[PDB]
From a paper:
Isocitrate dehydrogenase (IDH) catalyzes the oxidative decarboxylation of isocitrate to produce α-ketoglutarate and CO2 while reducing the cofactor nicotinamide adenine dinucleotide (phosphate) (NAD(P)+) to NAD(P)H using divalent metal cation (Mg2+ or Mn2+) in the tricarboxylic acid cycle. Although the amino acid sequence identity between subfamilies I and II is low (<20%), both IDHs function as homodimers; each monomer is composed of three domains: large, small, and clasp domains, and the active site is situated between the large and small domains. The thermoacidophilic archaeon Sulfolobus tokodaii strain 7, which grows optimally at 75°C and pH 3, has an open reading frame ST2166 in the genome encoding hypothetical IDH. In this study, we expressed, purified, and determined the crystal structures of ST2166 in the apo and NADP+-bound forms at 2.0 Å and 2.4 Å resolutions, respectively, and discussed the mechanisms for cofactor recognition of prokaryotic NADP-IDHs.
Numbering used by the authors:
A (entry chain B), B (entry chain A): 1 to 102, 109 to 409
The structure:
Amino acid sequence: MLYKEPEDGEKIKFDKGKWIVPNKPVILYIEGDGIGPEITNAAIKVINKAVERAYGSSREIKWLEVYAGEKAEKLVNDRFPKETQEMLLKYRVVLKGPLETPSVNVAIRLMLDLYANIRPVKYIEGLESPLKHPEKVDMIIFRENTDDLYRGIEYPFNSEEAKKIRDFLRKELKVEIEDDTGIGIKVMSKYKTQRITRLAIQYAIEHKRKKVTIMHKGNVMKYTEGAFREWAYEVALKEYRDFIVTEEEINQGKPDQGKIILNDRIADNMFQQIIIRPEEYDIILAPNVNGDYISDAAGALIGNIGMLGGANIGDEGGMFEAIHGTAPKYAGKNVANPTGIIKAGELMLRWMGWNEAADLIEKAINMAIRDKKVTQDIARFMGVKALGTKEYADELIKIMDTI
Amino acid sequence: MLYKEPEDGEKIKFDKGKWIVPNKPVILYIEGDGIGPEITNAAIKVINKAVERAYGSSREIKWLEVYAGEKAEKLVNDRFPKETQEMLLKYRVVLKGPLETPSVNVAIRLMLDLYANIRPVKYIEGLESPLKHPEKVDMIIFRENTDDLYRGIEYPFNSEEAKKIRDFLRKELKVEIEDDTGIGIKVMSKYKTQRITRLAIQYAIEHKRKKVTIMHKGNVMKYTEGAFREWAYEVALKEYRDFIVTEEEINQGKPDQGKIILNDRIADNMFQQIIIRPEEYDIILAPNVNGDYISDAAGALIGNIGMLGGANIGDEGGMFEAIHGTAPKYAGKNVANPTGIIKAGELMLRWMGWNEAADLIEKAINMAIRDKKVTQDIARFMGVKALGTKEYADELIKIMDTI
Ligand SMILES: NC(=O)c1ccc[n+]([C@@H]2O[C@H](COP(=O)([O-])OP(=O)(O)OC[C@H]3O[C@@H](n4cnc5c(N)ncnc54)[C@H](OP(=O)(O)O)[C@@H]3O)[C@@H](O)[C@H]2O)c1
Ligand SMILES: NC(=O)c1ccc[n+]([C@@H]2O[C@H](COP(=O)([O-])OP(=O)(O)OC[C@H]3O[C@@H](n4cnc5c(N)ncnc54)[C@H](OP(=O)(O)O)[C@@H]3O)[C@@H](O)[C@H]2O)c1
């Protein structure tokens, strides 16, 4: 066989969207292409120190590397070998480096049905920003990632399918539509909306987040994004009644002191407020297309998109990756910045409920960057000698040793 | 007749989209609700000083007030009187203050087929900003405003229409869709795309602009946003061949000296770059939804939406207004900032080819701010005494008399 499963650890379990983690959970990891190996191994080192520094030996991640991408092709002549697939369906938790494509990421998300795209973006003390006052940027985007126009139901204007549609709309729905038109079908599912929503609220509860904001354009798209809003409130008030409190209730007399706030904002407003007063957002709940855009903008609030981490969560598993590519320019040069993959580590740790260790990582990074101990991607702007990938991780390690 | 048309003026003519303006053009204006009267009259006063200062007496705007809104309800018992519609269909150019929606804006747009939403947004020395470096922010968003999901072709998840759509797509096109789904139809028209593109390029030529960037999400919406991109390039490479050069051609060998650059960016990249380096944008050519969102963000860059002008333009007419509302709390208190509407007039002036008057207005505003001579909405932050509406306008007038 290709992989030797660590007979020392146990697989993570899920009763109903909730993670049940063993003290020695087996976690898979894929180095990635290009800078992948250098930054991933660095992260794994940092994660371990953080785990031992927070729990001593009472907890330990039993890492299991699997092959995917260029390394897999070179070893077994298959970019996504069957055995890799088997370990993924069996352990379902993976930290993976960047993969190039001319799609492993797609396949993984689909076989584990990771419908929720999670994007946390928090300001890091020390980093330059395009914003004058980003000190309070501490939000996390929950993007439904299987619905909306991403379904791909569209047709060219000169196609026969488009014609059948125009014809059908004119007769049955009495809707007027010209011939020179491209056509796409925007779909919004109640089940899909209730899924992400339940996940967004459960997350707020367990991590003491104080607000969930539903992003939508329900005034022009009443039955798609409008319905998204409705279904979101609906399931929130029916299944999390004792934990939440709408905004229309707060300014209605009801008490919110000790509960999670749930409000909604028009797409337009958010694209404006994220720039003017981003501190207003805590958890952002959005359908597929809006969350994609909000994430791009949110992500831009802080310098170097390469220091952000993210994930794809399903009801029984998750994939954690940095928000960047392979950067073949630096492959094997010990120059790339591992903060991105490390932050995916921070995120994974939080999902696992191992917050003490995730806070250690978050704290060491803050301290290292404010202390001018950074990689070239940052050093090149603060006039200092950049640290290498390996040296930087180690600096994070010794820092965690005394905080 | 209810309206006394100035016998000294002439209507503005139209040739293939080109505004043919007499020296004594008649221009309709609507005071609007709330601060409308105060700000609109001040705009007219500054616009007339700009025109005069730039062209002495050889040109003059023959202003014609028409009634719309609550003033219309009060004088002739009609929110959008018949006499007003007739003046609009005849003169086709109007400067309109903010109107409270209880409708008129949409009705004017439709009756004049003003399909293009135009939003210029550029930095003003002295104004606060969310960005640390807004200095080179100087762009104009050209939004197609009659296509896309705004057409309203959508249906509730439990309507009989929705089930017909699901059945149709299932039997005729073989598409799998669950029953608990809201359904919306995104339409992208070749002709609507082509005309907005003609307007943008034509504006670029006319005003010595050098770059047109197409905003789209064609990688996921290939036949709608993607077609918008293809179609835009098409009309550009075929009808303005010796006026523009594509980004592909340039970084391929083609010389760009003496030509307008035409390129395209994926929507998500623009939500990032508009924040990190907006200076990279000149003219943004986008379809309905994208343009809406980018505009929201764009105008958020200056941080005083209430100082932005905008317009709706067709092949034979234009509506110019401020991006703010009726601000009822300040109605008739001579406190409201008139820069928004004045800016709308600046834009009207440029569309008329009266760039000299327009430049005067822009320079005056820049100076008034630089010299801390502003209305309260700005005084608040620069720690100086505030000028009233009336006084801020007379100051701009005092300034244009020196530049
Ligand atoms: N989740 C994923 O797996 C994922 C996501 C996006 C893209 N990709 C892949 O990336 C490949 C091409 O890369 P790209 O050039 O398109 O995006 P990239 O690999 O992310 O390179 C983008 C730029 O950002 C900087 N950068 C990226 N990672 C960095 C790091 N770890 N440390 C410091 N700086 C970093 C580099 O700045 P410099 O100019 O200083 O070199 C580089 O020029 C594509 O084939 C695509 O498949 C994968
Ligand atoms: N083009 C249009 O006709 C148009 C556009 C937008 C909205 N509206 C209409 O406005 C109506 C209600 O008003 P809204 O409150 O919804 O509009 P708004 O855009 O929200 O105007 C009110 C608020 O925005 C600020 N503001 C707007 N213009 C200002 C100015 N010229 N100077 C100083 N501050 C200004 C003020 O903030 P501060 O209190 O801090 O000074 C004020 O409290 C709606 O029914 C809607 O239909 C019309």
